[PDB]
Amino acid sequence: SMEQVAMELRLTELTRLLRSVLDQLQDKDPARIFAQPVSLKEVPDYLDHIKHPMDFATMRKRLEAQGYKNLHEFEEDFDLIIDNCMKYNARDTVFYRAAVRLRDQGGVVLRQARREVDSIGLE
Numbered sequence: 001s002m003e004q005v006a007m008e009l010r011l012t013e014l015t016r017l018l019r020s021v022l023d024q025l026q027d028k029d030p031a032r033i034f035a036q037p038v039s040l041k042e043v044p045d046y047l048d049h050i051k052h053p054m055d056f057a058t059m060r061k062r063l064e065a066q067g068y069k070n071l072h073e074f075e076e077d078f079d080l081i082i083d084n085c086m087k088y089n090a091r092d093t094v095f096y097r098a099a100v101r102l103r104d105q106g107g108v109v110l111r112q113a114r115r116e117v118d119s120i121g122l123e
């Protein structure tokens with residue numbers, strides 16, 4: 001149907017927007033602390049602590065499969081990256097402090113993204 005194609009065009013352009021947001025958020029992680037899943041070889045007990053791991057690479061995989069239906073789903077995954085880190089790592093660590101900075105600096109990007117999604121009506 002024509003309607004289904006229209007919907008797919010919308011999802012595709014949401015995906016385009018979210019890819020830009022993702023790239024912008026990842027730029028705020030030059031240390032690349034959040035680039036890849038926390039290694040169970042480097043951190044054997046991680047999954048005992050964190051029930052839903054997340055990282056930028058995993059987000060990108062879902063993104064490219066057009067697995068984010070709206071900005072809220074994307075934001076949920078971004079929040080997981082931050083929140084997991086602030087629980088697994090203590091306040092005084094380079095890890096925790098990196099999450100705080102990512103959350104603060106990411107907020108600006110997500111604030112405008114929300115306005116753009118609403119504006120262009122991508123969901």
Ligand SMILES: CNC(=O)c1cnc2ccccc2c1
Binds near residue numbers: 038039043085088089
């Ligand atoms: C977001 N990353 C982490 O939370 C983290 C924590 N500890 C680690 C220890 C050794 C190697 C990697 C680690 C990663």
Ligand code: NA
Binds near residue numbers: 086
């Ligand atoms: Na903690």
